[PDB]
Amino acid sequence: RTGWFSETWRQLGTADRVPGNWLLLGEVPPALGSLFDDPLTAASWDRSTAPDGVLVGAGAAEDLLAALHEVAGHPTGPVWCVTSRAVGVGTVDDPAADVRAAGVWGLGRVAGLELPDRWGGLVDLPERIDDATRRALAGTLTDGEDQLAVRDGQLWARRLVTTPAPQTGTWTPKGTVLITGGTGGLGGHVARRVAEQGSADRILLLSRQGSAAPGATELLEGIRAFGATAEAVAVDVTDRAAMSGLIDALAAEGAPVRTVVHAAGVVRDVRIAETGAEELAAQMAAKVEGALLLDELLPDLDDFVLFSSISGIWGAAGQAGYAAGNACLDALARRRREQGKRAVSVAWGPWAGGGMLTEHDERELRKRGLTPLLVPAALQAMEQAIMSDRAGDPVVADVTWSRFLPAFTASRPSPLFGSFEEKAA
Numbered sequence: 001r002t003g004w005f006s007e008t009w010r011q012l013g014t015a016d017r018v019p020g021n022w023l024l025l026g027e028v029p030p031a032l033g034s035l036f037d038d039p040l041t042a043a044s045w046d047r048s049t050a051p052d053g054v055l056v057g058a059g060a061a062e063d064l065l066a067a068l069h070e071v072a073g074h075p076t077g078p079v080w081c082v083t084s085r086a087v088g089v090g091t092v093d094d095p096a097a098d099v100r101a102a103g104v105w106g107l108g109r110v111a112g113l114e115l116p117d118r119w120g121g122l123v124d125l126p127e128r129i130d131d132a133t134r135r136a137l138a139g140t141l142t143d144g145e146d147q148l149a150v151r152d153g154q155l156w157a158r159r160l161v162t163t164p165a166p167q168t169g170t171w172t173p174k175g176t177v178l179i180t181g182g183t184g185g186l187g188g189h190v191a192r193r194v195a196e197q198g199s200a201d202r203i204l205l206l207s208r209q210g211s212a213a214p215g216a217t218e219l220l221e222g223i224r225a226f227g228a229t230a231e232a233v234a235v236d237v238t239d240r241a242a243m244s245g246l247i248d249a250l251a252a253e254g255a256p257v258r259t260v261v262h263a264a265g266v267v268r269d270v271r272i273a274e275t276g277a278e279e280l281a282a283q284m285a286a287k288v289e290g291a292l293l294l295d296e297l298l299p300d301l302d303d304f305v306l307f308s309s310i311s312g313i314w315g316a317a318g319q320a321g322y323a324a325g326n327a328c329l330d331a332l333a334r335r336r337r338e339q340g341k342r343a344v345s346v347a348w349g350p351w352a353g354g355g356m357l358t359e360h361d362e363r364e365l366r367k368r369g370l371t372p373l374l375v376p377a378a379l380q381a382m383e384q385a386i387m388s389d390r391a392g393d394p395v396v397a398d399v400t401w402s403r404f405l406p407a408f409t410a411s412r413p414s415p416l417f418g419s420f421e422e423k424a425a
């Protein structure tokens, strides 16, 4: 049975300062630096002394990555990371989405899994740090929650819960459908689904390999049987000149892009300790910079569909960059909807039937309570997510909680999944 889940936030039921010898990294603003008496910086810290805590001010995943490299191999107290505009609590005073800040949370969750005894947590604060905000943070740093937000002086804690699955009509995309990563595994399944519907004029499969991609010839032949024209174009989704050229040429033909499905991306297994800034950027490029470029160049679309991952929802060891990029996608969908435009980001669990996952990957996933979604089930859930009468960003995965939770929490407890614990209501 296909699991549908969503992020939600629980309002929790405060100090004037934070005692001790703290190390402040990244950009900690003056209204927070003043909570600490004589705090250390990266420059002033004598690495032989263990600070009582670390506070990292991060605007993007790279900032948190840099801070974690600074403290690697040195004893410190808990490492806490503060952001702003990184999460949407669902209150009236929620700020507008900051795509790059959201990446901090994707990476930070992975830090919790890789460095379970060292990682403190994430706190999202309002942009303007008033006295109420100062006190909420101080109480948090002085006092098991590790994914927190401050809104109107109150603390909220992040949770993952079930939602209802949308019950919708049929997805019938029209005109030109652009599928980035379209010659890949999931891209190909989506391409065939679109073709089968018989609603579109043109299906464009975009990837760096284009028509030179393995399997592309057979994929295109199969699509071309159904009525729409189809082509594979060899284009880097991060290349502004190439992307703008393609989009402009289609509009000039009277066949402008009307739907985007963004499945371009890469996945690597590299611990934070082994991930440099350049590699982090390479890991995030197609997924994040591609999506941002698409959003910019295509303000008027019927649909803008981002293929995200459970990695950006709850994290996995070795997936810092992958998780960060996926968290960015979820934020971009929120941002685009705030601008009055259609967008959905579906945070998928593993799929069966090819792509990123090898036969062996699939068997290890099942071990930790993740069963690959069958392709028909996944595609149906995709249609449901797109055609939903209400905006949301769904998490869609086949999770067996009795196996998943003990594996996920083996090295570190997780209040995120409270609703799946023994006797949870």
Ligand SMILES: NC(=O)C1=CN([C@@H]2O[C@H](COP(=O)(O)OP(=O)(O)OC[C@H]3O[C@@H](n4cnc5c(N)ncnc54)[C@H](OP(=O)(O)O)[C@@H]3O)[C@@H](O)[C@H]2O)C=CC1
Pocket (backbone or CB within 6 Å): 180, 181, 182, 183, 184, 185, 186, 187, 206, 207, 208, 209, 210, 213, 235, 236, 237, 238, 262, 263, 264, 265, 266, 285, 286, 287, 307, 308, 309, 310, 347, 348, 349, 350, 351, 352, 354, 355, 356, 357
């Ligand atoms: N398989 C799964 O279980 C899961 C997949 N996802 C997401 O689905 C998407 C596709 O996954 P999947 O089909 O498995 O993976 P694939 O590797 O099969 O497909 C990825 C595609 O992205 C393309 N790509 C990578 N970089 C660029 C770039 N700079 N410009 C244009 N295209 C690029 C690749 O082609 P090329 O190298 O030719 O450029 C390839 O076609 C990914 O974004 C992934 O994160 C999410 C959750 C689960």
